Amino acid sequence: AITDILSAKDIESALSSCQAADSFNYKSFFSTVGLSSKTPDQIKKVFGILDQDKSGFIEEEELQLFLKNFSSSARVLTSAETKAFLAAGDTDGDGKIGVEEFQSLVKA
Numbered sequence: 001a002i003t004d005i006l007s008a009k010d011i012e013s014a015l016s017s018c019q020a021a022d023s024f025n026y027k028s029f030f031s032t033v034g035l036s037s038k039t040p041d042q043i044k045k046v047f048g049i050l051d052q053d054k055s056g057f058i059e060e061e062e063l064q065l066f067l068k069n070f071s072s073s074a075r076v077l078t079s080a081e082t083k084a085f086l087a088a089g090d091t092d093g094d095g096k097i098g099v100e101e102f103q104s105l106v107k108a
């Protein structure tokens, strides 16, 4: 579970911050839930959850459902938010986010 590594309380605070459409920013969310200080294994576990269909990569539609991993009532990210998110993380430009890229994003 995601709460195996992250505090439900931190998650609540991160979600309340980005309730408005187009308010989302991965750097703010990542710090509020406390991803920045996690180890490779912990980051890999979080990645595995975000990779909802277990394909090994986080594709665009999964970035769309980014908040849904933290709360089933959370909103879907907008196309703009998703586009910017993917733009930030997709280093090699294959259109998706792999574990190495996710790690880099967390430790940036």
Ligand SMILES: [Ca+2]
Binding pocket: 051, 052, 053, 054, 055, 056, 057, 058, 059, 062
């Ligand atoms: Ca996937």
Ligand SMILES: [Ca+2]
Binding pocket: 089, 090, 091, 092, 093, 094, 095, 096, 097, 098, 101
């Ligand atoms: Ca990529």
